[PDB]
């Protein structure tokens, strides 16, 4: 199937408490592989997946250089955002950045991304064509014009269609055991009386990778979102994911209810029913 590489960066100002904190984190699909934290002693980009330890030592020096340049740049971008929004130096603010590339199962470039958020709101994003920018407000329109004038879309396109995909494909090979695995969910159903009169049926998907999954309830084979609870997909901490979906049911009518599990690792959707 398709694969994604994503770098996520967070810069947080803390006036009177030193320079902003910069955290960067790198992912391939739902698996983290690097970090950098300007507060940590190493002052190095660090591995967070076994397979990235195969990169040579030159890699660690190069990524450390570049993430430090990102750092110094987003520290200044916090001060530029202050000016544009006309805000005091007394308050803490957040600049988030995301970028990276998608490839098909053939390994060909699919899609490129490069976007910012200020104080948790969309600021600017590179559009699908990788030739143009969406700006959320007049401050981002200042950035949009600067970046058009300086051909920023062209520099970022050449990275996303080039080095980015090269990197993602090398990672997919060096970490094939991890990244290209497909762990189907292990599913079961639990039953929890609420009363003499009603019970919760809970449908479980455990140990699955990657994290994309769909859990659906039906009653007599028609979709059910009434009395349905669906929790966020959640990490187990071992590189796999968990999810459940629940219905409260008239006790003695359990068998009307089917749970349906869709996941890349199942050759076919699963139907679960209540089995004493």
């Amino acid at each position: 199937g398709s694969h994604s590489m994503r770098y996520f960066s967070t810069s947080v100002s803390r006036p009177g408490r030193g320079e902003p904190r910069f955290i960067a984190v790198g992912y391939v699909d739902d698996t983290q592989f690097v970090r950098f934290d300007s507060d940590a002693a190493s002052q190095r980009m660090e591995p967070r997946a076994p397979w990235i330890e195969q990169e040579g030592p030159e890699y660690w020096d190069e990524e450390t250089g570049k993430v430090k340049a990102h750092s110094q740049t987003d520290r200044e971008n916090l001060r530029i955002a202050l000016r544009y929004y006309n805000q005091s130096e007394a308050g803490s603010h957040t600049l988030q950045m995301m970028f990276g590339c998608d490839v098909g199962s053939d390994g060909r470039f699919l899609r490129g991304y490069h976007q910012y958020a200020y104080d948790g709101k969309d600021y600017i994003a590179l559009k699908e064509d990788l030739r143009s920018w969406t700006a959320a407000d007049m401050a981002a329109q200042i950035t949009k014009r600067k970046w058009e004038a300086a051909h920023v879309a062209e520099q970022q396109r050449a990275y996303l269609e080039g080095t980015c995909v090269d990197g993602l494909r090398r990672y997919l090979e060096n970490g094939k055991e991890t990244l290209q695995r497909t762990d189907p969910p292990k599913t079961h159903m639990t039953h929890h009386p609420i009363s003499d009169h009603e019970a919760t049926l809970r449908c479980w998907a455990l140990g699955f990778y990657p994290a994309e999954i769909t859990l659906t309830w039906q009653r007599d084979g028609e979709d059910q979102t009434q009395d349905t609870e669906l929790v966020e997909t959640r990490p187990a901490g071992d590189g796999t994911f968990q999810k459940w979906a629940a219905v409260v049911v008239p006790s003695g009518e359990e068998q009307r209810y089917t749970c349906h599990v869709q996941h890349e690792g199942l050759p076919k959707p699963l139907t679960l029913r209540w089995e004493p």
Partner: peptide, 9 residues
Amino acid sequence: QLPRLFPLL
């Protein structure tokens, strides 16, 4: 693998 250039707002 990171890019070399990071733009100013």
